[PDB]
Amino acid sequence: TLKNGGSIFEAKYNNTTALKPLFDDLPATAFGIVVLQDADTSCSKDTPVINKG
Amino acid sequence: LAGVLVNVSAAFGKHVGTRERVSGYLQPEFGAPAVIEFTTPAAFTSDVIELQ
Ligand SMILES: [Ca+2]
């Protein structure tokens, strides 16, 4: 959603049925991704492909 | 110049995914066959793709 503006470092994420803070929950061996600019909806949760811009 | 149409998803029974290869030959009654070989790209991102 943050492609349309907001605060990093306070982004939530969606475990089914709830919303919870991203950074605090992220496991020690994993990285998460937050779309800040994407004109053509190329990033999707199951396939984050980034293209020019 | 002529174009052969194949309903791949029906032929192989599923849609071909990303990072997969497909290879073959169109074999005439006599003479050398036309080789076909391509690997589908890593990221589908547009409706018509130039597998070439
Ligand atoms: Ca994009």
Coordinates of C-alpha atoms and ligand atoms in Angstrom, one line a residue:
Chain A
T1 CA 0.0 0.0 0.0
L2 CA 2.9 2.3 0.8
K3 CA 3.3 2.9 -3.0
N4 CA 0.8 5.6 -2.2
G5 CA 2.7 7.2 0.6
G6 CA 3.0 6.7 4.4
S7 CA 5.5 6.0 7.2
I8 CA 8.3 3.3 6.9
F9 CA 9.3 1.9 10.2
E10 CA 5.7 1.8 11.2
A11 CA 4.3 -0.4 8.4
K12 CA 2.0 -3.2 9.3
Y13 CA 1.7 -6.7 7.6
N14 CA -1.3 -9.2 7.3
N15 CA -1.2 -12.6 9.0
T16 CA -4.6 -14.0 7.9
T17 CA -7.4 -12.4 10.1
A18 CA -5.2 -9.6 11.6
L19 CA -2.8 -6.7 11.1
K20 CA 0.5 -6.6 13.1
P21 CA 3.7 -4.4 13.0
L22 CA 6.2 -5.6 10.3
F23 CA 9.7 -4.9 11.7
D24 CA 9.1 -6.4 15.2
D25 CA 7.7 -9.7 13.8
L26 CA 10.2 -10.4 11.0
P27 CA 12.3 -13.5 11.8
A28 CA 16.0 -13.6 12.3
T29 CA 16.8 -15.2 9.0
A30 CA 14.4 -13.4 6.7
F31 CA 13.9 -10.1 4.9
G32 CA 10.6 -8.4 4.1
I33 CA 9.8 -5.9 1.3
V34 CA 7.8 -2.6 1.1
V35 CA 7.0 -1.0 -2.2
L36 CA 7.7 2.7 -2.2
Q37 CA 7.4 3.5 -6.0
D38 CA 5.9 1.3 -8.7
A39 CA 4.0 2.7 -11.7
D40 CA 2.8 -0.6 -13.3
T41 CA 1.9 -2.8 -10.4
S42 CA 4.8 -5.1 -11.2
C43 CA 5.4 -6.0 -7.6
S44 CA 2.9 -8.6 -6.2
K45 CA 3.3 -10.3 -2.8
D46 CA 4.0 -13.7 -4.4
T47 CA 6.3 -12.3 -7.2
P48 CA 8.1 -9.1 -6.5
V49 CA 9.6 -8.2 -9.8
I50 CA 11.1 -4.7 -10.0
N51 CA 11.4 -2.9 -13.4
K52 CA 12.7 0.4 -14.6
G53 CA 11.6 3.2 -12.3
Chain B
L1 CA 5.8 -17.6 -44.4
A2 CA 3.2 -19.4 -42.2
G3 CA 2.4 -19.6 -38.6
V4 CA 1.6 -22.8 -36.7
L5 CA -0.8 -22.3 -33.7
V6 CA -0.5 -24.7 -30.7
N7 CA -2.8 -24.7 -27.6
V8 CA 0.0 -25.6 -25.3
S9 CA -2.0 -25.5 -22.1
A10 CA -4.3 -28.2 -23.5
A11 CA -1.4 -30.2 -25.1
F12 CA 0.7 -30.5 -22.0
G13 CA -2.3 -30.4 -19.8
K14 CA -1.0 -27.4 -17.8
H15 CA 0.3 -23.8 -18.4
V16 CA 4.1 -23.6 -18.8
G17 CA 5.6 -21.6 -15.9
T18 CA 8.6 -19.3 -15.6
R19 CA 12.2 -20.6 -15.9
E20 CA 11.1 -23.7 -17.8
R21 CA 12.4 -25.1 -21.1
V22 CA 10.5 -26.5 -24.1
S23 CA 12.1 -28.1 -27.0
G24 CA 11.1 -30.0 -30.1
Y25 CA 11.1 -30.4 -33.9
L26 CA 8.6 -30.0 -36.7
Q27 CA 9.5 -33.0 -38.9
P28 CA 8.4 -33.0 -42.5
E29 CA 7.7 -36.1 -44.6
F30 CA 11.1 -35.7 -46.2
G31 CA 13.9 -33.3 -45.4
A32 CA 15.5 -31.6 -42.4
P33 CA 13.4 -30.7 -39.4
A34 CA 12.9 -27.3 -38.0
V35 CA 14.4 -27.2 -34.4
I36 CA 12.4 -25.3 -31.7
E37 CA 14.1 -24.5 -28.3
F38 CA 13.4 -21.9 -25.7
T39 CA 13.4 -21.2 -22.0
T40 CA 10.5 -19.1 -20.7
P41 CA 11.9 -16.0 -19.0
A42 CA 12.2 -15.5 -15.2
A43 CA 9.4 -12.9 -15.0
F44 CA 6.3 -12.7 -17.0
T45 CA 5.3 -9.0 -17.1
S46 CA 3.2 -8.4 -20.3
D47 CA 0.6 -10.3 -22.2
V48 CA 2.4 -11.2 -25.4
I49 CA 6.0 -12.4 -25.0
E50 CA 8.8 -12.8 -27.5
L51 CA 10.1 -16.3 -26.7
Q52 CA 12.1 -16.2 -30.0
Ligands
CA1 CA 7.2 -1.6 -11.9

